[PDB]
Ligand SMILES: O=C(O)c1cccc(/C=N/OCCCNCc2cc(=O)[nH]c(=O)[nH]2)c1
């Protein structure tokens with residue numbers, strides 16, 4: 001395996017020598033010496049490994065990786081087998097079941113099948129100390145994942161950006177709405193899910209927008 005997918009590396013490596021990025025690398029490495037940090041190193045960039053950057057169709061922006069054992073694996077909201085879907089993911093699946101008629105809970109939480117179809121599952125912050133939500137916030141990841149969003153904004157067209165909750169909404173504020181589609185609603189966490197997420201119908205809406213972009217739809221059941 002490689003640490004960072006080749007097509008993504010080609011377009012993002014201009015970030016790597018910037019002071020903030022070297023500092024970020026140093027910070028994460030130091031944290032790993034003294035704490036358990038999630039996801040493990042070979043999974044921090046899973047979101048670069050599942051499809052070619054040119055093949056991205058949909059971008060779902062999250063905030064912090066899961067901070068419990070075995071949960072985070074580098075795709076926002078996803079958990080590898082045999083880990084049970086956490087509450088936010090159960091809510092995503094519940095919305096899918098009402099939005100997409102044929103969708104049924106797949107019995108696992110691994111969203112790799114969406115990532116392979118060009119659904120970029122990007123958290124703003126890409127590492128977290130075990131059991132400490134937001135522990136790696138404002139350490140340099142935000143600038144890097146801003147560069148990812150900016151690259152897609154300027155180098156692709158007709159994407160659908162799904163911004164769930166206030167942090168993702170802030171992070172997507174500069175998306176060119178002449179060039180790309182943007183949908184916004186509440187975060188799927190239990191505390192926020194009934195403030196817009198349930199009933200948002202983002203999955204069917206995304207496929208209709210992809211059709212307007214002249215692109216084939218996502219099969220949300222392909223998991
Ligand atoms: O910005 C907002 O409006 C907002 C409002 C209420 C709750 C939250 C969410 N809190 O997250 C609860 C912790 C569980 N995190 C699941 C998860 C979130 C995520 O962004 N990325 C990820 O990979 N996994 C965000």
Ligand code: NA
Nearest residue numbers: 026029030033
């Ligand atoms: Na060190």
